[PDB]
UniProtKB/Swiss-Prot annotation, chains B, D:
Top-level taxon in the UniProt lineage: Eukaryota
Residues included from the entire protein: 875 to 1246 of 1575
Signal peptide boundaries: none
Function (record text): Binds to activated CDC42 and RAC1 but does not seem to stimulate their GTPase activity. Associates with calmodulin.
Tissue: Isoform 2 expression is enhanced in testis.
Name of this chain's protein: Ras GTPase-activating-like protein IQGAP2
Modification type Phosphothreonine: residues: T7, T128
Species this chain originates from: Homo sapiens
Domain Ras-GAP: 59-308
Length: 177, 372, 177, 372, 177, 177
């Protein structure tokens, strides 16, 4: 039974664990705890074949930088995540994440993934961003970054509502071929 | 390992709580004797910045802050004014967390311009102290005059004003000060909407709490407490120490001059009085001319403070329903821990050439995987 | 004539300001208003000699540390104060204060100064320190710290009853001589 | 679960050895199947950099390297050449550790100058491949003349040399190549004394070990093995990829051009051949003019490699006696690990209103006492 | 005429150079000398048509990764190699090689190539694989990997006995056609 | 019984733990283990008084940057250490250590401490330093840095031979008064 290794990396608190748990249990983590590392497994069949989709969650906090690379071997596809409602996380995609995964896995394809899209229309987050003279990252801006950084493509979702959630992993699986 | 076991457990608990339950760590910090909570402040605040980076957790921090402040009020506050004299560690953490949360540029993105204006004026020398001005005059200007200082060196306050010259420098300083001060005050008063929701909300909880316990407290008294939080505690320190609270980036060179300090310090004195509705007098009589300004500034501050509390409940402010109506899961938490090694009795170490520490060599086969 | 520079420092709310007012104006400030920096002038006789004692009132809260040293240059004697009905304040004498003034003014003499002694002999207060398992500082407890920190000599008073007030500044001038 | 623990426990062991016994971790790495040891190389080496920063520890690492290399030889090496084809992981670690240890600037402080010279020459375009040159000639330079490539766009080697013009570019390239190569070679050969002791020592161990097991091996064969370690494995990669092995600071801009790659790569090819005493021929006949240089260069390399092994044993190199004639002790050890939380249900917690949590008090006293 | 670019890659020492030599010069290289980069030319008939096969030999060692791609531009077919008496080399086919050439040449066909098959039927070798608990790769094990990695078809040979050698490049050209 | 708190900070592997252990037990650590945190206590009497010298070992490695400061409160004197045969540790004294302790403890005095002085004449370390175009730090250079960084003074020693070891703590004590 062929396996597909998918690793999720990105700034701390951007929603990496939530999207993984939401996608594999259809539930939402009841609280936040910065992860160290963890890995789940789920079976899918986009090609009549029973593949084992290995999902690897990593730490986003820099405090855990030394440990993070341990999850990178034999990775088939990377999911570089950022919060569409958190600009700083978007910038670190090119300032930290892509550089890191391309340093450890130059040949491995990755997707740029926007998370927390359900907060784009949330009053308080919009107001919060405006007080700082900012606005949610737009699909167009991210899709550009994806092209510049040579990502397979961009995709976004909401672990909360699951809007786009499945498509994210369908693509990941597609890119892992 | 008597004393040593303690220390170990302390760090063990501390870093366990920091990663997995900072809200609870915070709570423990609040109930510790006050002097002792000081060493944990920075490290917990730092972790809260990350923890509270999403609205659901910021919501929980707000509730923690709230119940702790109310817990403090109806438990240690007996005659109002206690929430101020008592120096509650909850307020200290609320104040700090709001300084450098992650809307970051809040105080510097509000006081830097006008503060940078007072620091840059290489000529400004406000000094509301007669004796100091007096001594600073010919007592320091007779340098390029000779005769040293044929005058009575070191005089009182009442007689420093004998010399009209000295009464003039003060006159100007009083003018300067009021000009500079008004600049600051306008930056503040006009930017109430730039203040952090969280800070505003605690000011509300604060007021609504003292008032619930002391109905005989007047709008005036309440707003003076609320002003203590927002002005004297929150932003006044940034005005006096912009280099300490990072209001103005300090490029490797030199720190604030005594003149710059005295300048910023004088503005803070003036504004403190205004927010606390205290006119100059008795010993501070020579500044009485400002009493008119102080009373208008207070009326502005008062309006400001009252409006600061005008804000929704976190449940409403963040649509918490997107969270409370969810089907959640609580998978087991993995965290980074500190461990100690037992330590083999010297008796067996003296003979490790014959005995020999146990070792898992079939371990490199286990190690040879990790993540498949 | 003769001027003596005496700087009053110590934890906020211990009553540093009150003692300076009820002494120079024999009036006890009703409400509490934390200070930034103030100055008082009072000429008093010591050894049959007229001296002008310069009183520098400072801020106690830690957030005003950068500012406080502005009052330290050329000081004759320092008045480290604390509330006898607040152990917290007492602990900070050897924890913050003494250490600070000793950095800026190595060879300057100082006295230890207890305050609010009138509350020590007060039930409603002692019952508060009890509900937190604490006991009002004692003249002996203090005097020991005085000698340990190499002070000039402990002294105490009450801004409300003015008890012992006057003696404070007398020992002060004496110390500066 | 009973599965995540076996794993969690294998991770805790990794963290423990990394901080408490890297020497043993390294050993476990040597015995793992080779494809599997790759995921621990960087992280262990990184730790060894700090661990072997003092001579006593570097001494132990050297002894670890030694016994492991001899372990490898008398156990997996049957016909010499096996220490090379077998890609022993001890050699992989020996090489990496010597690249970025503590004397850091060693290869960059030895190759950077001449490499920086070959990179900077915006006109240098070495290409020892006829068909590639041919196709590059009018088969490409005619993009500024038109009439396209009226010639056989894509020919063979032999006939690419039919065109005296193409035979000329090659001619020049061979001149350029020999010129840049000699610069590289001289930097290396004249700087044998700048090589790391540990690297020279392992080359010595390596040589004396193969010789011990294969007495019928000649000085020439032995030195080709030693040259494999010092040249093909240690520095040749830094010449070919100075951007990858940090020989030249890469300021945010652009990476090496294909032309710079082909240039550095060409030098590496000529030097490999020389170090391995292999003359150009059969298919590489067009470069045969260099065979005279190759044979002189080999003689220089051969002399270099032999001298490389000319070094004392570590016991003597570092007066290790200063650490043996000494009263030692072993204090308790503390370390950082991973741990999973059981997650149990608390009976009393729901009743803190009635029972006052004795946990919050203990935990607060504990935390409160941290330090003194 | 007609030229086919065929690049040979794979773990160092698996025999990439030896197969290229004993094929084009029917001679088996005595000693081992790892390569940096080389080129071979051989014209062979396929379908009654004369084709010039360009053979690009590369370096297997990881320390030469930055250099290898220099041989990849415009390649018709890739020959991923591994030694049948070396599992280690086989593991890297799907671990490094296939992933690398797939990054640089997405739509380029490649074949799987087993080598040193003459050692597979050798005791002194098998006893070495036993003392480490390993078993020579088998045509079946391989062929499975070929289909899994989306190869063109597994093939194997011996540079020493030249067994199956010739057929390798024939399938190579066919794949490039 | 009056206590004196001395905290030792400095780059990893420069000798902090060894000088503390050698000074308090005259034994020498048999192996090297980076410390996380540790604190011992010893009694001395330079003034006829039985003082308790509290010694705190700290982690030199940056990974513990967030944990180390917890040892700083109530410090009487700091020992900023660097290896005289390790130039990089010497430079971090001004790039990292002095800044850190003065950020946490502005008023606390500190001594600059050179360690491993016995290696100044060790052949292999001199040679090693020469290959890198370096030489052991000279007392003169260190003394200069102490003056510039406003250290109480510079002192050096060897935990191995104990040469200068006691004087280091004698001065620390002296400076902590
Ligand atoms: N509204 C909304 N909030 C989200 C969403 N995803 C995550 N969050 C919030 O963000 C918090 C943190 O998300 P996590 O996924 O745990 O953070 P992370 O990406 O794992 O970060 P680290 O583990 O520290 O690297 C969650 O607890 C939620 O409060 C989302 O899709 N919608
Ligand atoms: N009952 C009683 N209250 C006192 C006495 N002295 C001071 N207080 C009260 O203590 C509170 C603060 O007094 P302050 O003198 O302002 O304290 P402080 O030392 O000046 O504090 P800062 O200026 O903020 O550093 C007010 O309620 C004073 O009335 C006293 O002797 N008896
Ligand atoms: N017995 C046997 N040995 C072989 C065969 N093919 C290669 N070898 C041996 O394997 C070792 C290395 O062969 P090479 O062809 O140089 O290896 P390579 O693939 O070029 O390795 P690099 O140039 O380092 O990437 C030498 O001993 C070769 O003789 C074979 O078919 N049978
Ligand atoms: N020759 C010599 N070697 C020393 C001396 N002090 C320490 N060393 C060597 O340096 C090694 C590490 O010293 P430690 O004191 O353990 O390192 P540290 O300063 O505690 O570093 P961390 O605990 O990781 O922050 C010791 O194990 C010895 O090998 C010394 O005075 N002379
Ligand atoms: Mg995560
Ligand atoms: Mg005051
Ligand atoms: Mg080859
Ligand atoms: Mg240490």
């Amino acid at each position: 039974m062929q396996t597909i290794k998918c690793v999720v990396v990105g700034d701390g608190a951007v929603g990496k664990t939530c999207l993984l748990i939401s996608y594999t249990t259809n539930k939402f983590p009841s609280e936040y705890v910065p992860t160290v590392f963890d890995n789940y497994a789920v079976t899918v069949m986009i090609g009549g074949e029973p593949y084992t989709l290995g999902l690897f969650d990593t730490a986003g906090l820099e405090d855990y930088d030394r440990l993070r690379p341990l999850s990178y071997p034999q990775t088939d596809v990377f999911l570089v995540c950022f919060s569409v409602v958190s600009p700083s996380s978007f910038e670190n995609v090119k300032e930290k994440w892509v550089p890191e995964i391309t340093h450890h896995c130059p040949k491995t394809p990755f997707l740029l993934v926007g998370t927390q899209i359900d907060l784009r229309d949330d009053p308080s987050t919009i107001e919060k961003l405006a007080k700082n003279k900012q606005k949610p990252i737009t699909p167009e801006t991210a899709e550009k970054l994806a092209r510049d950084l040579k990502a397979v493509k961009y995709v976004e979702c909401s672990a909360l509502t699951q809007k786009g959630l499945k498509n994210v992993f369908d693509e990941a699986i597609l890119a892992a071929l | 390992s008597k004393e040593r076991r303690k220390t170990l457990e302390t760090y063990q608990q501390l870093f366990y709580l920091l990663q997995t339950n900072p809200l609870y760590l915070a709570k423990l910090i609040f109930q510790m004797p006050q002097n002792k909570s000081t060493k944990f402040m920075d490290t917990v605040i730092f972790t809260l910045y990350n923890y509270a980076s999403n609205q659901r957790e910021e919501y929980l921090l707000l509730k923690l802050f709230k119940t702790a402040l109310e817990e403090e009020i109806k438990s240690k506050v007996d005659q109002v004014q206690d929430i101020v004299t008592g120096n509650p560690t909850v307020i200290k953490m609320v104040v700090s967390f709001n300084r450098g949360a992650r809307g970051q540029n809040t105080l510097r993105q509000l006081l830097a311009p006008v503060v940078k204006e007072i620091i840059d004026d290489k000529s400004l020398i406000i000094n509301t102290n007669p004796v100091e001005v007096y001594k600073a005059w010919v007592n320091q200007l007779e340098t390029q005059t000779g005769e040293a200082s044929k005058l009575p060196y070191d005089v009182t306050t009442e007689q420093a004003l004998t010399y009209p010259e000295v009464k003039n420098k003060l006159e100007a300083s009083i003018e300067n000060l009021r000009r500079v001060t008004d600049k600051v005050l306008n930056s503040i008063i006009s930017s109430l909407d730039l203040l952090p929701y969280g800070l505003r909300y605690i000011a509300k909880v604060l007021k609504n709490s003292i008032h619930e316990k002391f109905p005989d407290a007047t709008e005036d008294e309440l707003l003076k407490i609320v002003g203590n939080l927002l002005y004297y505690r929150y932003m006044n320190p940034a005005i006096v120490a912009p280099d300490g609270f990072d209001i103005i980036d300090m490029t490797a060179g030199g720190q604030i001059n005594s003149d710059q300090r005295r300048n910023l310090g004088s503005v803070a004195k003036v504004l403190q009085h205004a927010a606390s509705n205290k006119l100059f007098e008795g010993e501070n009589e020579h500044l009485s001319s400002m009493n008119n300004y102080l009373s208008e500034t207070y009326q502005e501050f008062r309006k400001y403070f009252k409006e600061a509390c005008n804000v929704p409940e976190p449940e409403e402010k963040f649509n918490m329903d997107k969270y409370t109506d969810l089907v959640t899961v609580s998978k087991p938490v993995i965290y980074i821990s500190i461990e100690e090694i037992i330590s083999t009795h010297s008796l067996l170490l003296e003979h490790q050439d014959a005995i020999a520490p146990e070792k898992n060599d079939l371990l490199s086969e286990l190690l040879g995987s990790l993540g498949e």
